[PDB]
Amino acid sequence: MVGRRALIVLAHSERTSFNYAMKEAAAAALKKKGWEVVESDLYAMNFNPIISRKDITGKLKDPANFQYPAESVLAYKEGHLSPDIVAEQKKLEAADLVIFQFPLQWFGVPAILKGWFERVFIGEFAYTYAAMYDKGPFRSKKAVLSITTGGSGSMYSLQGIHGDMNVILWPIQSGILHFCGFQVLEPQLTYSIGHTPADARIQILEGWKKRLENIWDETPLYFAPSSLFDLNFQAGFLMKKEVQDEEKNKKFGLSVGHHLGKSIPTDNQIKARK
Amino acid sequence: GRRALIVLAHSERTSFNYAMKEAAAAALKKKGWEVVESDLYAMNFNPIISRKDITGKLKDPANFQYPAESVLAYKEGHLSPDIVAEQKKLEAADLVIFQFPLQWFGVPAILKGWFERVFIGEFAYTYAAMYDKGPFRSKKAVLSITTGGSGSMYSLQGIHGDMNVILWPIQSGILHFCGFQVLEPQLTYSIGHTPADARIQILEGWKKRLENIWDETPLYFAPSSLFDLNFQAGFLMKKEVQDEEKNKKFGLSVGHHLGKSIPTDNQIKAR
């Protein structure tokens, strides 16, 4: 897709890493199809992942009782956010596709990437309470996670010691990415990369590249639409009574998080359905 | 005389999180606990893993791998001293309380980093000893979490979805993986809209709970003995155990749902 912009966020310190190789592969593949490609190599930027007062360069509303959510929003609108935050915000605004490339660390994102989310995804910019989930600011955009693990895929199967990978991805894909409005595409999961032989590693790279050629035409993952819920305080943001009645006699729930005490649809967070 | 470690991840001394830390310390000292703190913001704790975490000679600096190198450094004792100081607090401690606000459906970056730099292989886990067999099986941990959203938003029918799913990666994947018995989480919902008189009752309730915290029953995780713990079997549930669960309506846990119903409040209440 020529005219389209991609942001690649990388969270690995080493240029010798397979994560770095997957980043470079993606950039190459995408440029070849005529994408503009911007990067946030968080280690190379020495990105500061800790929220603090110093994120606001102007005057605090209330420095005696500092609240990061309230103050960060004011700073966004009056335009006195720390410039490092703003630079990242501009990359996001510009971008149509966001690829996150990172190793799984303690069942989640690396601290440096977690911090990126905390400092960059500010209220009013990346979400409001009016516009949550499918109605959020980034509904035009598509995001994908590309994850490498130490553990093997068997360990993350339904019968694996670690348990279902779908549950592990839910807080990131739903609670961070979709909450801001992103359409989330199937994750690229690269299991036990340390114990994958060299010829296979090369096929994985070739497979990533091949996938990115038609990435924009992919169907996204299923999350419950916001229209299934009463979006106000008096109703408690609960699923509507009509929708609850329509789901009563279904065997499967809507998603991992909206399991509703029933079975979770197979690979809700890993494969799309039409 | 038992020992408690309180890990706090909030920058502000005016915060309810700070108030809950102080409450816990007070309550616990009164019952004759020794109480150590890791106030991560106040310590200016460095949450980013890097080469600088190893003060000695790298095995292989051309192809640096944090897991392999960090373990060597632990064994030969050339870990950065800030890591080691935290490691000593953990070793000493019987009860570990994590006090933090929920940020983006998870722990703050600074606390996540603490886990990454402090929970090193051989110290906090092996491979031989995962989950209930892990090094910290003598210890108990509890999460104490504040949210902006209300508990309804995190119910089965809430816009955000089941809180049990949100806690699973932390309680199972981090805490229990290293061996901790995990106690029922202390969840303080919609703290932003709770007036001062109520906040004080919440603090009094926390304090009251901590008087008998050690006698509490922990959360249920699938025992490791249900699995074949070796590489050739792929760490899968044993065939006999799979056959015995076939007919059950409910799964074992949030992560081990097995395509069936999740036991109610698996990550929030003990059986």
Ligand SMILES: Cc1cc2nc3c(=O)[nH]c(=O)nc-3n(C[C@H](O)[C@H](O)[C@H](O)COP(=O)(O)OP(=O)(O)OC[C@H]3O[C@@H](n4cnc5c(N)ncnc54)[C@H](O)[C@@H]3O)c2cc1C
């Ligand atoms: C703090 C921490 C916590 C962790 N927690 C977890 C956890 O909870 N769960 C889990 O499953 N894992 C966990 N891990 C493991 C982690 O996910 C893996 O180390 C990571 O995914 C490996 O990716 P890498 O890119 O760093 O691998 P590397 O070891 O850097 O790369 C793997 C192999 O690919 C080779 N390679 C490099 N470039 C190329 C190329 N261009 N072509 C071909 N081969 C190439 C390398 O030389 C090497 O042989 C954790 C690790 C850390 C540090």
Ligand SMILES: Cc1cc2nc3c(=O)[nH]c(=O)nc-3n(C[C@H](O)[C@H](O)[C@H](O)COP(=O)(O)OP(=O)(O)OC[C@H]3O[C@@H](n4cnc5c(N)ncnc54)[C@H](O)[C@@H]3O)c2cc1C
């Ligand atoms: C980056 C980021 C991401 C977030 N993501 C999420 C998310 O995913 N989900 C979610 O639900 N929320 C989220 N939030 C909101 C966040 O969880 C809340 O703002 C937080 O839990 C508030 O708790 P606090 O301790 O900071 O309270 P504060 O607002 O700082 O404190 C509450 C009040 O209690 C008062 N107080 C202190 N001590 C006492 C005392 N002893 N007696 C009486 N009153 C006292 C204080 O003065 C203050 O006025 C996020 C916030 C941030 C910054």
Ligand SMILES: NC(=O)c1ccc[n+]([C@@H]2O[C@H](COP(=O)([O-])OP(=O)(O)OC[C@H]3O[C@@H](n4cnc5c(N)ncnc54)[C@H](O)[C@@H]3O)[C@@H](O)[C@H]2O)c1
């Ligand atoms: N960052 C996030 O991802 C995220 C997500 C969800 C919520 N939040 C936070 O939640 C805030 C708002 O939610 P909250 O839980 O703090 O508000 P709340 O539910 O405590 O307040 C609701 C309002 O209605 C009143 N009210 C109380 N009981 C009621 C009842 N039974 N029926 C009707 N009205 C009642 C309250 O006094 C208050 O004025 C947001 O502004 C934000 O700070 C953040």
